[model samples]
Target: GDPKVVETYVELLKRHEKAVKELLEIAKTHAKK
Candidate 1:
């Protein structure tokens, strides 16, 4: 029997995507204001 394992790489990618989105939103807000 094999145990299920969770990978951190997927989490890292999601975190990066979220960070980029937040950064873009902040830049846009600053530009508007």
Candidate 2:
């Protein structure tokens, strides 16, 4: 695999991780209520 492609993949995952975490928190809040 190319180094640049791997770096991009890592960046993409980092971006999605935040989004996923935000969604998870929202789901948790709904469950409590």
Candidate 3:
């Protein structure tokens, strides 16, 4: 179903975005230190 695919895509995107954001934050903090 289209709705199912959309839901899965959104979930994946959310997870990927969270990981990228966390990594960037860590890098920034390390650079500041």
Candidate 4:
């Protein structure tokens, strides 16, 4: 029960982390304008 639960959680957070990084990168580029 516990093993698959933690594995899924890590993937969920990783997906969010990727989006967050991309959003921040876009913000930085927009600031240059």
Candidate 5:
């Protein structure tokens, strides 16, 4: 399926959501101190 398939795009957004969440936790753990 083309990447633009609506369902696939939803999955992509959710994947990035978790990625961004982990990014904040990991980055802030070091920087917050």
Candidate 6:
């Protein structure tokens, strides 16, 4: 593991949250057309 490259839980969760949000948003949009 490189000390120069590290990911915290908050950052990881934020990424997942963003991903899930985008996924749901895309699904919502595609669900219509």
> Model 1 clash pairs?
none
Model 1 deviation from the true structure expressed as Cα RMSD, one decimal place:
3.7
lDDT of 5 by residue, 1-33 (tens): 875798888999999999999999999998977
Evaluate candidate 6 by giving its C-alpha RMSD to the native, one decimal. Answer: 3.8
Task: Kindly list the per-residue Cα lDDT of model 3 for residues 1-33, writing each as its tens digit.
Answer: 689999999999999999999999999999999
| lDDT minimum window of 10 residues, candidate 1 | 1-10
How does each model score on lDDT? 0.82, 0.97, 0.98, 0.96, 0.92, 0.84
TM-score of 5: 0.67
Candidates 3 and 4 compared by TM-score, better number:
4
Tens digits of per-residue lDDT for model 4 on 1-33? 798999999999999999999999999999996
How do the residues 1-33 of candidate 6 rate in per-residue lDDT, one tens digit apiece?
A: 664445575678799999999999999999997
lDDT of 1 by residue, 1-33 (tens): 222233466677799999999999999999999
Error of 2 at 33 (Å): 1.8
Candidate 5 regions exceeding 4 Å error are 1-4
Give a tens-digit lDDT track for model 2, residues 1-33.
999999999999999999999999999999998
The residue pairs that clash in candidate 2, if any, are none
lDDT of 1: 0.82
Clashing pairs in 4: none
Ranking by lDDT: 3, 2, 4, 5, 6, 1
